[PDB]
């Protein structure tokens, strides 16, 4: 049974820092790319950051390249997402989604965590 | 007898991005779309590159070494047609 | 530079047992590398319709996408009190891959 749960959310200060953790269970974590996606308080949706398989490989969007960091644990089955320099733009229901495997493979988030809300002032 | 109404065009893209190259061919039969990559067909087999419908190439997580000239090759039992564009990846 | 994804209406209520439609445009071509997702209140986004044209797995076929090029369409017919959430369009094409703001879908 695929279960994501996000955790690491809560309140900080503006240039201040945070890391998320997702803990995966009931699939082959180490065969998916992970993605972090986040909605803001007006409900706009925006990717964040993508990790392939063997976190050999990141991708940020330029709203948060160089100020957010991914990477996953593949034996304990955990993706990290290490902000900082937060600014009050980055205040959000922060998701962790797994990458679906797919024909034709398009990139598709087929399961997602609940989320864990960040709120920066 | 295949024609190419758009062919790849020329881009600068970023490290890590996500970039294609579309390749729409007219013809009949309905032409098949191959891609060259500096002269060598591409392997859709690495997972970073993929082909998806209606001629697109697809290229993920694009590394310094992606940068190079793409030729579309249309084909049908008839004939064939090229294509080609210039990619940097920066 | 980046692919836009603007998405019509905004919002709509509509009545139960009735289609729908909700648009996507692109500020380019995008050879049908979309994607759909549905978002029920204080819940996450699920995955609806994949490449454009392609039904999600455990998904209700009252849901289907439609389009090519720049336009696309998500219907829903026969609309039942469940699908009651906000339905985003997602640009698959290229980095970076912009959302659509949303479509929030209420019942009268």
Redesign the interface.
């Known amino acids: 049974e695929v279960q994501l749960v996000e955790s690491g959310g809560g309140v900080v200060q503006p240039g201040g820092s945070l890391k998320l953790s997702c803990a995966a269970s009931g699939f082959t974590f180490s065969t998916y790319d992970m993605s972090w996606?986040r909605?803001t308080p007006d409900?706009?949706?925006?990717?964040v950051a993508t990790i392939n398989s063997n976190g050999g490989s990141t991708?940020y969007?330029?709203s948060v390249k160089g100020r957010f960091t991914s990477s996953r644990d593949n034996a304990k089955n955990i993706l990290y997402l290490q902000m900082s320099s937060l600014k009050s733009e980055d205040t959000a229901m922060y998701?962790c989604?797994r990458e679906?495997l797919?024909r034709?493979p398009?990139?598709?988030?087929?399961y997602?965590?609940?989320?864990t809300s960040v709120t920066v002032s | 007898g295949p024609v190419i109404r758009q062919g790849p065009v020329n881009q600068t893209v970023?490290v890590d991005?996500?970039?294609?190259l579309?390749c729409v061919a007219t013809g009949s039969p309905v032409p098949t779309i191959l891609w060259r990559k500096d002269g060598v067909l591409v392997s859709t087999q690495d997972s970073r590159i993929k082909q998806?419908?209606?001629?697109?190439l697809?290229i993920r997580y694009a590394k310094l070494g992606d940068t190079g000239r793409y030729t579309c090759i249309a084909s049908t039992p008839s004939g064939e047609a090229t294509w080609s564009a210039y990619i940097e990846v920066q | 530079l980046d692919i836009q994804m603007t998405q019509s209406p905004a919002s709509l209520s509509a009545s139960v047992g009735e289609t729908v439609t909700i648009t996507c445009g692109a500020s380019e071509?995008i050879?049908?590398?979309l994607?759909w997702?549905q978002?029920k209140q204080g819940?996450?986004?699920?995955?609806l319709i994949?490449?454009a044209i392609?039904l999600?797995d455990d998904k209700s076929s009252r849901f289907s996408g439609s389009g090519?090029g720049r336009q696309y369409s998500l219907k829903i017919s026969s609309l039942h009190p469940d699908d009651v959430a906000?339905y985003?369009c997602?640009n698959?094409?290229?980095?970076?891959?912009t959302?659509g703001?949303?479509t929030?879908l209420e019942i009268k």
């Open positions: 996606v909605q409900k706009r949706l925006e990717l991708y969007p330029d998701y989604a679906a797919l034709p398009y990139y598709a988030l087929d997602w965590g609940q989320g | 970023a991005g996500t970039f294609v579309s998806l419908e209606n001629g697109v697809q | 071509n050879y049908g590398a994607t997702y978002r819940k996450s986004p699920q995955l994949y490449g392609n999600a090519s906000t985003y997602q698959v094409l290229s980095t970076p891959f959302f703001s949303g929030k």
